Design an enzyme around this catalytic site. Structure first.
Site, mmCIF file in Angstrom:
data_model
loop_
_atom_site.group_PDB
_atom_site.id
_atom_site.type_symbol
_atom_site.label_atom_id
_atom_site.label_comp_id
_atom_site.label_asym_id
_atom_site.label_seq_id
_atom_site.Cartn_x
_atom_site.Cartn_y
_atom_site.Cartn_z
ATOM 1 N N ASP A 148 0.711 -1.279 0.213
ATOM 2 C CA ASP A 148 0.121 0.051 -0.073
ATOM 3 C C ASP A 148 0.992 1.506 0.407
ATOM 4 O O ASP A 148 0.102 2.225 -0.153
ATOM 5 C CB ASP A 148 -1.080 0.206 0.988
ATOM 6 C CG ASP A 148 -2.237 -0.291 0.987
ATOM 7 O OD1 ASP A 148 -2.090 -1.825 0.422
ATOM 8 O OD2 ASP A 148 -2.293 -1.054 2.204
ATOM 9 N N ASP B 183 -9.079 -7.223 8.680
ATOM 10 C CA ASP B 183 -9.059 -5.779 7.737
ATOM 11 C C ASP B 183 -9.254 -4.692 8.746
ATOM 12 O O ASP B 183 -8.879 -3.395 8.554
ATOM 13 C CB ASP B 183 -10.012 -5.817 6.688
ATOM 14 C CG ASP B 183 -9.646 -7.502 4.944
ATOM 15 O OD1 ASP B 183 -8.398 -7.630 5.624
ATOM 16 O OD2 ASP B 183 -10.408 -6.872 4.748
HETATM 17 O O1 LIG Z 1 3.684 -12.753 16.093
HETATM 18 C C1 LIG Z 1 2.284 -13.593 16.432
HETATM 19 C C2 LIG Z 1 0.997 -13.116 16.847
HETATM 20 O O2 LIG Z 1 0.073 -13.582 15.661
HETATM 21 C C3 LIG Z 1 -0.905 -12.165 15.837
HETATM 22 O O3 LIG Z 1 -1.669 -12.210 14.624
HETATM 23 C C4 LIG Z 1 -1.266 -10.859 13.640
HETATM 24 C C5 LIG Z 1 -0.602 -11.921 12.400
HETATM 25 O O4 LIG Z 1 0.134 -12.899 12.405
HETATM 26 C C6 LIG Z 1 -0.261 -10.860 11.010
HETATM 27 O O5 LIG Z 1 -0.734 -12.172 9.608
HETATM 28 C C7 LIG Z 1 -1.017 -9.358 11.618
HETATM 29 O O6 LIG Z 1 -0.933 -8.911 10.117
HETATM 30 C C8 LIG Z 1 -2.193 -8.408 9.526
HETATM 31 C C9 LIG Z 1 -2.012 -6.680 9.733
HETATM 32 O O7 LIG Z 1 -1.816 -6.785 11.398
HETATM 33 C C10 LIG Z 1 -2.811 -5.901 9.120
HETATM 34 O O8 LIG Z 1 -2.937 -4.894 9.004
HETATM 35 C C11 LIG Z 1 -3.235 -6.543 7.465
HETATM 36 O O9 LIG Z 1 -3.871 -5.207 7.324
HETATM 37 C C12 LIG Z 1 -4.538 -4.936 5.959
HETATM 38 C C13 LIG Z 1 -6.290 -5.246 6.308
HETATM 39 O O10 LIG Z 1 -6.108 -6.844 5.725
HETATM 40 C C14 LIG Z 1 -6.376 -4.026 4.969
HETATM 41 O O11 LIG Z 1 -7.512 -4.800 4.307
HETATM 42 C C15 LIG Z 1 -6.180 -3.080 5.245
HETATM 43 O O12 LIG Z 1 -5.742 -2.713 6.464
HETATM 44 O O13 LIG Z 1 -4.668 -2.655 5.403
HETATM 45 C C16 LIG Z 1 -3.708 -4.247 5.729
HETATM 46 C C17 LIG Z 1 -2.160 -4.639 4.965
HETATM 47 O O14 LIG Z 1 -3.079 -4.904 3.525
HETATM 48 O O15 LIG Z 1 -3.537 -7.354 7.291
HETATM 49 C C18 LIG Z 1 -2.123 -8.513 8.075
HETATM 50 C C19 LIG Z 1 -2.990 -10.134 8.036
HETATM 51 O O16 LIG Z 1 -3.651 -10.137 7.975
HETATM 52 O O17 LIG Z 1 -1.546 -9.427 12.006
HETATM 53 C C20 LIG Z 1 -1.347 -10.173 13.105
HETATM 54 C C21 LIG Z 1 -2.198 -8.920 14.477
HETATM 55 O O18 LIG Z 1 -0.222 -8.553 14.754
HETATM 56 C C22 LIG Z 1 -1.638 -12.557 16.831
HETATM 57 O O19 LIG Z 1 -2.573 -11.795 16.903
HETATM 58 C C23 LIG Z 1 -0.331 -12.673 18.424
HETATM 59 O O20 LIG Z 1 -2.250 -13.123 19.163
HETATM 60 C C24 LIG Z 1 -0.032 -12.953 18.622
HETATM 61 O O21 LIG Z 1 0.713 -13.069 19.699
HETATM 62 O O1 LIG Z 2 -6.069 -2.654 -1.312
HETATM 63 C C1 LIG Z 2 -6.109 -3.081 0.189
HETATM 64 C C2 LIG Z 2 -5.764 -1.849 0.742
HETATM 65 O O2 LIG Z 2 -6.790 -0.575 0.166
HETATM 66 C C3 LIG Z 2 -6.546 0.737 0.330
HETATM 67 O O3 LIG Z 2 -7.425 1.280 0.170
HETATM 68 C C4 LIG Z 2 -7.643 1.407 -1.788
HETATM 69 C C5 LIG Z 2 -8.389 0.351 -2.256
HETATM 70 O O4 LIG Z 2 -8.069 -0.159 -2.445
HETATM 71 C C6 LIG Z 2 -8.646 0.985 -3.562
HETATM 72 O O5 LIG Z 2 -9.636 0.796 -4.276
HETATM 73 C C7 LIG Z 2 -9.131 2.480 -3.601
HETATM 74 O O6 LIG Z 2 -8.768 2.900 -5.366
HETATM 75 C C8 LIG Z 2 -9.520 4.448 -5.267
HETATM 76 C C9 LIG Z 2 -8.093 5.013 -6.258
HETATM 77 O O7 LIG Z 2 -6.931 4.754 -5.196
HETATM 78 C C10 LIG Z 2 -9.020 6.202 -7.157
HETATM 79 O O8 LIG Z 2 -7.538 7.256 -7.792
HETATM 80 C C11 LIG Z 2 -10.064 6.243 -7.525
HETATM 81 O O9 LIG Z 2 -10.853 7.879 -8.086
HETATM 82 O O10 LIG Z 2 -11.049 5.343 -6.893
HETATM 83 C C12 LIG Z 2 -10.695 4.376 -6.299
HETATM 84 C C13 LIG Z 2 -11.442 3.621 -5.342
HETATM 85 O O11 LIG Z 2 -12.822 4.400 -6.172
HETATM 86 O O12 LIG Z 2 -7.695 3.642 -2.904
HETATM 87 C C14 LIG Z 2 -7.354 2.801 -1.505
HETATM 88 C C15 LIG Z 2 -7.026 4.021 -0.989
HETATM 89 O O13 LIG Z 2 -6.938 5.291 -1.360
HETATM 90 C C16 LIG Z 2 -6.544 1.156 1.900
HETATM 91 O O14 LIG Z 2 -6.155 2.109 1.950
HETATM 92 C C17 LIG Z 2 -5.572 -0.202 2.462
HETATM 93 O O15 LIG Z 2 -5.685 -0.210 4.024
HETATM 94 C C18 LIG Z 2 -5.982 -1.281 1.855
HETATM 95 O O16 LIG Z 2 -4.503 -2.296 2.752
#
Ligand SMILES: OC[C@H]1O[C@@H](O[C@H]2[C@H](O)[C@@H](O)[C@H](O[C@H]3[C@H](O)[C@@H](O)[C@H](O[C@H]4[C@H](O)[C@@H](O)[C@@H](O)O[C@@H]4CO)O[C@@H]3CO)O[C@@H]2CO)[C@H](O)[C@@H](O)[C@@H]1O
Ligand SMILES: OC[C@H]1O[C@@H](O[C@H]2[C@H](O)[C@@H](O)[C@H](O[C@H]3[C@H](O)[C@@H](O)[C@H](O)O[C@@H]3CO)O[C@@H]2CO)[C@H](O)[C@@H](O)[C@@H]1O
Ligand SMILES: [Ca+2]
Ligand SMILES: [Ca+2]
Length: 428
Positions: A141, A363
């Site tokens: 990201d 997430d």
């Molecule tokens: O180390 C042992 C410990 O593990 C803990 O869980 C971890 C897990 O192992 C790890 O995979 C995970 O990583 C997350 C990350 O924290 C999170 O920020 C990221 O989130 C994404 C999200 O899905 C997106 O949609 C958006 O939010 O942006 C981010 C980036 O793409 O996703 C990853 C993968 O899930 O974190 C866990 C928490 O630290 C246990 O909780 C603990 O008990 C163990 O001791």
């Molecule tokens: O992919 C997972 C991560 O997504 C981050 O959000 C982004 C969205 O995935 C993406 O679809 C969106 O796209 C925008 C684009 O940037 C913009 O130019 C256009 O006008 O609209 C699109 C959406 O309709 O962008 C966002 C970021 O702004 C999350 O922020 C991140 O946490 C997550 O891991």
């Protein structure tokens, strides 16, 4: 170094993720669903290094690598283990669910180098691990946010810390001969539009050519990390197809973005980068953890052909797309399905499909007022509000599932949906 670290290796199976899967299977009444969960636990997922504590917590980075050596010995084949480097300062700068522990204004870049990258590099440098293939996914990201989100001060103020931190990580990692390096480059529903696509090609070319090895510093790029965008939209293969006088890419869901799926997007990016001087040995990864879109959710089931309704582009596209999210920007806690299993070289120019985001992990928390002990900067993001509207287009619901814990914690309601909705379906 190998041309493709996934060829001739078996994927690392993370026992700590598998234990959550099996524990949920043991609490699942439906014996077929439970058997499907046990089968899911056998697949390979990436290990996220998402804070300094993750280097040593539990088995720690050393523990995972030792476990990888164990699995390699037991199988008599090389193991490829995927690591996600995920702790830049001002992390997740365009959202709230995954803000990290380091801040640019609080010496974050210096701490990133000294307390996060340096100890990771020291561990990966151990000659005990020379027989593994170690794949490092670099800071999901971060660089895509520099393309699209410079109007957010947290992103714009971090841009040189991102560049220097990422170059620092890659320059150090490239001194380790069995480490294979992939930069994250979002997904088609983020950077597919012409302006975003070209901005990304420019940005990543500048980032890499300033590395110590120039265009030889990385092995490629990964798309779709932690997102849900399909590998392929089989019933919308031509973005310029005319329906009711208009090209289907003009549909509301796409907003003139010609990249409907990750295969089109990843291969077009690869070709663009080769045209800028990257060697043709670069390969692309795609995160297929949660982009299968089997089952039913959001008022639709998976389409089985192009829509019969050709009365408008919106009706046609909405009836034909396998990505059935309400809005393409809905990234949080979606009722999707597990996608293709991890597999090497599924298509020329694609090194592997991988599960980088581990299915079942949240997430983001679904309501405000709840503080997580272990990630004190993780906050509620409105994109995770099951009762809210998208903050990218308020005309659409977020689609987020309710009762979600903070990002990364186990989300059993979504895991059950992801398994039920897997495509191809899970076979016990
Ligand atoms: O180390 C042992 C410990 O593990 C803990 O869980 C971890 C897990 O192992 C790890 O995979 C995970 O990583 C997350 C990350 O924290 C999170 O920020 C990221 O989130 C994404 C999200 O899905 C997106 O949609 C958006 O939010 O942006 C981010 C980036 O793409 O996703 C990853 C993968 O899930 O974190 C866990 C928490 O630290 C246990 O909780 C603990 O008990 C163990 O001791
Ligand atoms: O992919 C997972 C991560 O997504 C981050 O959000 C982004 C969205 O995935 C993406 O679809 C969106 O796209 C925008 C684009 O940037 C913009 O130019 C256009 O006008 O609209 C699109 C959406 O309709 O962008 C966002 C970021 O702004 C999350 O922020 C991140 O946490 C997550 O891991
Ligand atoms: Ca290669
Ligand atoms: Ca396509």
């Amino acid at each position: 170094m190998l041309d493709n670290p996934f060829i001739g290796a078996i994927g690392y199976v993370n026992p700590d993720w598998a234990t959550n899967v099996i524990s949920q299977a043991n609490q699942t009444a439906d014996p077929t669903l439970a058997a499907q969960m046990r089968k899911v636990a056998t697949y390979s997922t990436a290990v996220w290094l998402d804070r300094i504590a993750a280097i040593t917590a539990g088995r720690g980075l050393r523990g995972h690598l030792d476990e990888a050596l164990r699995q390699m010995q037991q199988a008599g084949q090389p193991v490829v283990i995927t690591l996600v480097i995920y702790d830049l300062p001002n992390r997740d700068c365009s959202a709230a669910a995954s803000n990290g522990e380091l801040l640019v204004a609080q010496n974050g870049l210096a701490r990133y180098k000294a307390e996060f990258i340096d100890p990771i590099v020291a561990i990966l440098s151990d000659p005990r691990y020379a027989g593994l293939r170690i794949v490092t996914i670099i800071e999901p990201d971060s660089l895509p946010n520099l393309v699209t989100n410079l109007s957010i001060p947290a992103c714009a103020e971090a841009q040189n810390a991102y560049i220097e931190g990422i170059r620092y990580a890659v320059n150090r990692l490239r001194t380790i001969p069995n480490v294979y390096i992939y930069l994250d480059i979002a997904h088609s529903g983020w950077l597919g539009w012409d302006n975003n696509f070209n901005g990304a090609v420019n940005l990543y070319t500048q980032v890499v050519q300033g590395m110590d090895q120039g265009f030889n510093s990385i092995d490629g790029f990964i798309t779709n990390v932690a997102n849900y965008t399909p590998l392929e939209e089989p019933y919308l293969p031509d973005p310029n197809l005319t329906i009711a006088g208009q090209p289907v890419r003009s549909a509301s869901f796409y907003e003139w973005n010609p990249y409907f799926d990750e295969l089109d997007y990843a291969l077009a990016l690869r070709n663009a980068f080769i045209g800028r001087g990257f060697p043709s040995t670069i390969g692309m990864l795609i995160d297929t953890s949660r982009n299968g879109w089997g089952g039913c959710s959001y008022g639709r089931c998976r389409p089985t052909g192009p829509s019969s309704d050709t009365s408008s582009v919106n009706a046609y596209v909405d009836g034909s797309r396998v990505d059935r999210r309400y809005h393409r920007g809905n990234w949080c806690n979606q009722a999707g399905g597990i996608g293709e299993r991890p597999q090497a070289a599924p298509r020329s120019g694609i090194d592997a499909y991988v599960w980088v985001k581990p299915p079942g992990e949240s997430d983001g928390v679904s309501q405000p007022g709840i503080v997580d002990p272990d990630d004190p900067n993780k906050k509620f993001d409105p994109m995770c509000d099951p009762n809210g509207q998208s903050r990218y287009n308020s005309a659409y619901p977020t689609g987020a599932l309710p009762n979600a814990p903070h990002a990364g914690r186990w989300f059993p309601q979504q895991f059950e949906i992801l398994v039920r909705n897997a495509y191809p379906p899970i076979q016990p």
